[PDB]
Structure formats: structure tokens, C-alpha cells
Structure 1
Amino acid sequence: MQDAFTKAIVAADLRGSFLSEQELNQLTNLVKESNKRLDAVNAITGNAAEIISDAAHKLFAEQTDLIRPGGNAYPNRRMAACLRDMEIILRYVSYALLAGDASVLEDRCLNGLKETYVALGTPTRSVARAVQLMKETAIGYVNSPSGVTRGDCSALVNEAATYFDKAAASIA
């Protein structure tokens, strides 16, 4: 697997060189943000259940047909699958967020997912919508916690977004 640190290493390796001082300073600062980074993750994990629950409600309100007989979410078993899928995507996203790298996410979570959905007949599009729905709710928590020292999380927030979006895109 890979993450922010490891990555930079690898790059350096192919040049055949010790790390640039400049490059260290990327990592040095990355460290400093850790604490912020962590809390971000913590927030997602803490609210997981909810995030999904929420997103689902909205997805079904929008695309009524999903829950109608003949739709992809019907019946129960299919509905359960749809909920399960949302969780899986989320879980990975979180992982990435901690790593500070998309890779992990791109590998197990998404590589191949789109094709599966097409064969199944689940509308890749609808799933993508849900991924976004999730995104927004999630950010909601990341960005509005309680008992944390107040400061700027934007940097992290955006990176979070990106992860969600890579997801949305590759699925779609």
C-alpha cells in the first residue's frame, strides 16, 4: 500500500537520491497538521451510522423509483445491499483521509466498481449521487464539532472532498 510519506520516498528513490531539504519541509509541515487530520477522521468515524442513514433518506426522497417495485433498491435485500455499499465507500474514504493519500481508496474500494454496477443494472449515476449526498453530510460533521480547539480545517476539508469526488467520478 501507500500513503503521503511512503509516496514521497518512492519518488525520491527513482531519482536515486536522498530526500531534498525542500521535500522534508513538506513532510515536516504535514506532521504539524496531524492533530487536525486526526480529529477530522475521528469526526467521520464517530458519526458514521448517521452520515449514511441521512444520505440514504435523501437519496430515496429524490429517486422515488429506487424503492418502487421493479427499481434497484426493491426489495428489502436489495435495499440492504445499497446501504452496505454506502458504508463500504465511506469506510475507505476515511482510510484515505488518514493516510493522506487516495491510493488505498482507488485500489480496493473503487477499481472495478463501475463495471460491476453496470452489469448489475444499478444506475451508476444514482450511486454517484448518494456518494455526494454522503460527502456533504460528512463534511458537515468534520467542520462543526464540539470541544475541539477552534482553528482552520479547510485544507483537510478540501482533501476530504477530493476523495469523495474521485469516488463519485470513478463509479459514475
Structure 2
Amino acid sequence: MQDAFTKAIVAADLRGSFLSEQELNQLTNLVKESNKRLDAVNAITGNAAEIISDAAHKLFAEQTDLIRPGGNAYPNRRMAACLRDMEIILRYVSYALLAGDASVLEDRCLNGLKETYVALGTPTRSVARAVQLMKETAIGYVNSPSGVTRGDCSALVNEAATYFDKAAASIA
């Protein structure tokens, strides 16, 4: 598994080199913003259930076919599987966010996922949408939390978004 430092190290090694002063300071900056990062990961963990629930309510509000017989979130067994997948993806997105690298998300979650869903008959476009809704709400929470010091988290909100967007793209 990689994190943002480990990634630097792998690229340096492929040159046969000690880390460039370029790369050093990029990593010094990651340490600089790490308290914000911890709050951002904490924002997701602290509202995981609601993020999934709210995404869910809204997914089925839009796509009332999934909860009809014939639909891929019917009966209870399938809805529980769908709720479970929402949690799994939100989980690996939070891991990537602590790590500063998408690899755990791509390697443990996204790799093969689309082909799984197609084999199953699970409508990937609906799954992509559920991921887009989780993103909206998750970032909502990253941006408006309990008595965190006031500052600018937009860099981290972007990065979190790209992890949500990776997952969506990979699946649709």
C-alpha cells in the first residue's frame, strides 16, 4: 500500500536517487496541512452513517425503479448489499484521504468492481450516482463541522472529491 510519502520514495528509487529538494518540500507541505487532513478524515468518520443514509434516501428518491420488484435494490437482501457497498466505498475514500494517495482505493476497492457489477446485473450508472451523492454530503461535512478552527480546506475538499470522482468514473 502507498501513501503520499511512499509514492515519492518509489519514484525517487526508480531514479536511483535520494529524494529531490523538490519532492522534500512537497512532503513538508503535506505535514504542514496534516491537522486539517485529520479533521477532514474525522468529518467523514463522524458522519459515516448519515452520509450513507442521506445518499441512499436521495438515490431512491431519484430512481424509484430500484425499489420496485425487478429492481436491483429489491428485496431486503439486495438493499442491504447496496447499503453495504455504499459503506465500503465511503470507507476506502476516507482511507485514501488519510493517506494522501488513491492507491488503497484503486487496488482494494475499484479494481475489478465494474466487471463484478456487470456480471451481477447491478446498474453501474445508479451506483455511480450513489457515489456522487455521498461526495456532496461528505464534503458538506468536511466544510461545516463542530468547533474546528476557522481556515481554508478547499485543497483537501478537492482532493476528497477526486477520490469520489475516481470511484464514480471507474464504476459507471
User: Residue 61 of structure 1: CA displacement?
Assistant: 0.5
Cα offsets for 1:65-90 (capped at 9, x unmatched):
10001111110101110000000000
User: Residue 60 of structure 1: CA displacement?
Assistant: 0.3
User: Residue 160 of structure 1: CA displacement?
Assistant: 0.2
Matches of 2:170 and 2:20 in 1, distance apart?
Answer: 34
Matches of 2:10 and 2:119 in 1, distance apart?
Answer: 37
User: Residue 146 of structure 1: CA displacement?
Assistant: 1.9
Query: Equivalent residue for 1:74?
Result: 74
User: Residue 21 of structure 1: CA displacement?
Assistant: 1.2
User: Residue 129 of structure 1: CA displacement?
Assistant: 0.4
Provide TM-score, normalisation by structure 1.
0.99
Q: Provide the alpha-carbon RMSD of the alignment.
A: 0.6
Segments of 5+ residues of structure 1 without an aligned counterpart are: none
User: Residue 55 of structure 1: CA displacement?
Assistant: 0.3
Matches of 1:155 and 1:38 in 2, distance apart?
Answer: 14
Q: Write out aligned runs for 1:91-170 (5 A).
A: 91-170=91-170
Matches of 2:70 and 2:12 in 1, distance apart?
Answer: 54
Cα offsets for 1:87-144 (capped at 9, x unmatched):
0000000000000000010001110010010111110100000000110000000000
User: Residue 19 of structure 1: CA displacement?
Assistant: 1.1
Following TM superposition, the consecutive aligned residue runs of length 4 or more in structure 1 with deviations greater than 2 angstroms are none
* 1:45 partnered with 2:45: yes
Matches of 2:43 and 2:166 in 1, distance apart?
Answer: 21
Segments of 5+ residues of structure 2 without an aligned counterpart are: none
Cα offsets for 1:133-166 (capped at 9, x unmatched):
1100000000001211000000000000000000
Query: Equivalent residue for 1:171?
Result: 171
Matches of 1:73 and 1:30 in 2, distance apart?
Answer: 40
**1:149 alignment partner, SS class:** coil
Matches of 2:92 and 2:50 in 1, distance apart?
Answer: 17
User: Residue 22 of structure 1: CA displacement?
Assistant: 1.8
Provide TM-score, normalisation by structure 2.
0.99
**1:64 alignment partner, SS class:** coil
**1:66 alignment partner, SS class:** coil
**1:65 alignment partner, SS class:** coil
| Total equivalences in the alignment | 172
User: Residue 28 of structure 1: CA displacement?
Assistant: 0.7
Matches of 1:130 and 1:22 in 2, distance apart?
Answer: 39
**2:65 alignment partner, SS class:** helix
